[PDB]
Amino acid sequence: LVLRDGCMRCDADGLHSLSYHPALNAILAVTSRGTIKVIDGTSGATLQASALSAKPGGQVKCQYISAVDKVIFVDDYAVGCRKDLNGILLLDTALQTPVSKQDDVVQLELPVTEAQQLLSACIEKIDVSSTEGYDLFITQLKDGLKNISHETAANHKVAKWATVTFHLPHHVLKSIASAIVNELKKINQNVAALPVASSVMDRLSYLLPSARPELGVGPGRSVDRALMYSEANRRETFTSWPHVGYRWAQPDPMAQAGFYHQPASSGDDRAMCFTCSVCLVCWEPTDEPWSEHERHSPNCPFVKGEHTQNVPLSVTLATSPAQLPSADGADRIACFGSGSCPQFLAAATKRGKICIWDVSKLMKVHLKFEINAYDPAIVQQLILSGMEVSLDITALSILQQPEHNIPFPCLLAGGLLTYKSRRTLPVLLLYSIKESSVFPKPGTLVQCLRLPKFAEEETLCIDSITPCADGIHLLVGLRTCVSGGYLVLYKMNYTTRIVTLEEEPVKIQHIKDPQDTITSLILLPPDILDNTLGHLVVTTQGGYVKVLDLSNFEILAKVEPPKKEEQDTFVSVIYCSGTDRLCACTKGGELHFLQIGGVELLVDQPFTLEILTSLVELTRFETLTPRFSATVPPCWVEVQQEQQQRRHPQHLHQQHHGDAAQHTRTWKLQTDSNSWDEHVFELVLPKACMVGHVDFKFVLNSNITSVPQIQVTLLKNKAPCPFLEDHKEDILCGPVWLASGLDLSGHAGMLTLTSPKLVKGMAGGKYRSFLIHVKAVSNLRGCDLLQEVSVTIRRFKKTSICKERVQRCAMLQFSEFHEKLLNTLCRRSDDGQVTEHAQSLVLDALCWLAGVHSNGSGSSKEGNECLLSKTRKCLSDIVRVCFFEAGRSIAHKCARFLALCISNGKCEPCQPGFGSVLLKALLDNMCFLPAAATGGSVYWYFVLLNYVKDEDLAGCSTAC
């Protein structure tokens, strides 16, 4: 049974198809009229509404590919490709083809904030107004920003997704952009609108094919300095680079660093920069490009991070113009499909023309061919049935083998062969893709597989081709051109250099009911329902959502369609991986969210070494996810990748400690924004798992001497100052002091946020997202002292024993466990004698507990007062054994434990002074100082005495 977890009405005209973006937590809902609605993944608020049409009257389909992190929008005529731009997708120009003439009116979609710096630059600093068409551009900018200003006040997530659109001729736009960049040159200050206008002129350059000059990558050809403000041009300069095998002289980090290849007779690896023109030759494999750029030109504005004309790869790949599959543009796309190869995308027309594109890098044509209907493999299958022959393509999929030569990717096309004997025969076609025992040419037919006879008898066609998750099996969906269709399961053959298919299918399922005809299908990852070839979720023609096991085609669950306020039949379904629920749309425009569905305690067992080793395995931590979804206030910016390159180089950037650094997100504050208080950072995790702690790094202003009162809080995302007051039940960690997490240097500081409520909060796996609110309690004001902020989220380490969570809850919850921990540490154990290694194990577990309810800092804090009480009960003994009998490592751990207790003693209301009783314990233990074994324990003893002697000085005066 699958439960209906709420409903909202998305559109009045109905919904058609759904897609989901886990990296931004957004559902792309397509309506019946061709409009795509952007809906937030947990709140359900409509973030953006846009109408997409290359030509009027076409139906719109959208699909996201996870491995290339790109969303493909397909209408009847154009495909294109677009991707993420600083948290958003640019939709309004996603289906825009390049124009032919200069006077053609073009569309330019621009996000809100850099449109605001463009407006501020054009009003406060820049005079263009003698240029033609300036007033209409200014009017369009004002009207767009004023129309958006009503939408921005409803929600922050709606506010960040909005976009300004312009509708102007191309010559007016390039003249305005050229005037703006020339004025920003002669005014000559670092204004943030200069990269924006350089990007606008770059997009206008890509929007006309004849405005692009030919690439001058050759000996003797001079490259124009105007085209190298884009990073993509710097990337295509290195096509003839002689140092491909170099570790750091790869084309991408140094196209990122501003360098380009312009070879000369004096050097084949000759490389200069685009904005400072420093000339560098004779590259060695140990030269980092950023380090060499800073070394040979430290005065370069691109090295210093100032606002240059640099158009990065992100904006260019996020503003790719649409490409028609054919040159004429009057052709309708019959079908499209992306299979197990995520870097390739293919579309087919009505007469048999197939164009294959590569979507890893910038959107380009990989292969174009037309299917011949008189291929001898098809003629052989026609002969085997024993003359006008036509063939139509109904489905597409691109197949890659799961990981001496590696076998090449291949294309699968579903064909419906028509002949007069008028009879229809559905066939499957296998083609070769990659450019080069005769090797087949790309676009040639490899295998023509005939469907079994019931498809020809019932006049069926191939509806969907989707590979399975294991890379071994494949499912084919059949429908009528009355039986409800078929589900046919095939097996791929990997016995040779080309991926082929077995002729006999493994499993065939008959859909007898025409109301059970398949309308949409998605394949679930096997790891979700492990609490077998996988699981299949199918929406039917009658409106039923059915859960099917892929091995035996058995209905596991069934969801009836809702009733209209006639039944509102379900149309398409998508699985939201971030929130682990199924989004299903109806023909009435409603979206329905569907959710799929005594112990031995180690604290109660006697404490030998194996139990303590298990306990510290529960205490241990690790990094959590490669990247969590997080959006910002507009005053905070997402960092460039170049700063991460300064942290870790390119080979270290992937699968290394660069992954450990890109778990961290670096966010920098600008000083132009009016408010420096109430900044809210929402932190959406891609998958729910238990969180030990989160990090909070920051850099203070150097000029200010003392830090004013600033609070940092951590909150849950129950519903996606009075902001803390409405969410006072939603806090995990309490409001902590910023100076408590300050480093010994006043400039830098690291806050760690955790609580007992944080480690006991993950009860049902429900805490999908987190919130951070920062507030300064009341020239530099508010958060303007903080130039930088950085957040790292870490999890617990996975341990092999069953039921970790209830043992963690008993670990935080039991007073008796704390008492026996410190009792076995006092060495006054009634059973056995405690070894020093077992003591160190006890200190690790106990000080982990003390750190958790130290950093909690809540109001009641029974655990904090509790552990402080039983440490005050046995303080002389813990000081004696750790600082006299044990080694200096265990004495060091006890020193950190007692220092953390000094830290949490001030948050605890603390009627007996903890420093006073610690001083009393040490002054009780002075008479054993010559009898101590190791000198480091004496040193840490004296270090603790050095702080706690400031409370009562006469005790050490007499005794010392």
């Binding site: 010994l744 240097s745 000080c847 434990f897 000094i902």
Partner: protein
Amino acid sequence: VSVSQALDARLEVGLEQQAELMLKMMSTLEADSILQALTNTS
């Protein structure tokens, strides 16, 4: 007043980094205090 910095980067994944920082600040503060006493006598 401070002569030591640069805590180990394996500590920040641990929770007790603030405690080891306050120990390091404790040692540097007392070293500064005794040196300030020896200077402040003259």
